[PDB]
């Protein structure tokens with residue numbers, strides 16, 4: 027609960043489990059999402075990233091650790107996907123999210139990014155900016171956004187984007203490392219780069235993706 | 250021999266990753282419907298074989314996927330260290346449940362039924378036999394009995410301090426002898442599972458890194474928290 031720098035002692039050095047199964051998968055169901063949320067809490071995870079108004083609602087009634095809410099939408103006239111409408115923001119607040127993350131890139135979008143960021147702050151929830159570049163974070167800071175993340179770097183590669191984490195951290199930002207941290211050792215280099223916490227999704231909660239990671243290596247060797 | 254021969258299975262499995270779908274016991278994810286869902290998912294993602302635990306999980310999974318199942322029943326007994334399929338009644342249930350290969354503990358330890366009789370109960374079903382071995386002698390014994398598959402499953406799980414890195418030497422030793430070798434145990438990343446194939450394994454079984462969310466979660470927090478306090 028309550029102020030941002032209390033959230034920053036709670037999240038220091040933590041791994042944040044982004045529970046977003048593959049779309050269309052047999053695993054892409056609210057029950058299995060809640061089950062994973064209950065499970066990672068028992069294993070010591072202190073925070074989650076959950077996608078979908080009704081997934082946030084289901085998970086928030088079953089766990090106690092903070093939830094970073096998002097909604098993903100494939101728009102027909104824009105590349106922005108992560109929470110592009112204030113009406114999504116309002117649902118995420120109602121659903122029980124502690125932080126609401128949004129795409130903070132300077133691209134074509136149905137509603138200005140200043141209004142999304144300011145609509146989150148209105149909720150009472152913390153705001154986290156999903157950034158693609160260092161200057162996305164400069165914009166986010168000027169708008170009163172509590173959290174900046176490297177979520178969108180490279181999605182506008184294969185290794186994480188560590189220098190963005192270094193720049194955000196030595197800018198004084200409350201920095202969330204997110205994107206391609208696929209082993210515990212890459213997530214440790216994130217914290218040492220100055221990130222307060224690190225978000226990990228595919229390596230933890232996308233079984234199809236990780237399965238293909240192994241078969242790719244074992245089949246390639248099988249000559 | 251439901252419809253297959255040994256060398257037909259070994260080309261089907263060559264260079265493949267075998268997904269061990271065994272949630273943590275008592276976990277919210279340890280449900281049959283969740284196990285079947287995970288089984289359907291890895292098949293859709295291209296996995297060619299599974300290890301499934303529990304007679305009724307084997308039955309449920311075999312009715313929903315098409316890839317072969319290596320069935321086991323694991324029991325923690327009060328008077329024996331053997332865990333992997335220690336009873337003849339377990340073998341018969343796994344065959345009826347639809348498993349193609351049945352894995353058993355092949356170690357020379359205290360056990361309710363001799364390892365020879367277990368192996369012979371598998372053959373009676375018609376299923377292929379996979380020996381879960383702890384030492385090279387265990388696979389050599391399995392060789393003398395006609396067991397089709399030998400695995401490094403039990404290497405490091407007989408003593409006290411249970412290891413962290415895979416045991417590549419036993420996989421090489423089983424491969425050097427001409428055995429049809431399955432590398433299994435502690436292959437937790439795609440490159441270590443690749444070093445297993447390069448070590449001569451036909452296929453490789455991976456469990457915790459894929460289907461134990463609690464375990465992998467603790468793997469990350471252990472590294473981020475330790476640095477996060479430094």
Ligand SMILES: CC(=O)N[C@@H](C=O)[C@@H](O)[C@H](O)[C@H](O)COP(=O)([O-])[O-]
Pocket residue numbers: 044046096107108177178181204205206207208225226227228229
């Ligand atoms: C582009 C986009 O939508 N990125 C993320 C949005 O939340 C999402 O796809 C991903 O799960 C997180 O970044 C977690 O990171 P990773 O561990 O999956 O790489």
Ligand SMILES: CC(=O)N[C@@H](C=O)[C@@H](O)[C@H](O)[C@H](O)COP(=O)([O-])[O-]
Pocket residue numbers: 269271321332333402403406433434435436437454455456457458
């Ligand atoms: C000791 C024992 O009973 N081991 C296996 C039993 O079937 C099982 O617990 C283990 O997950 C597999 O070896 C898969 O290997 P890994 O990926 O979990 O390391």
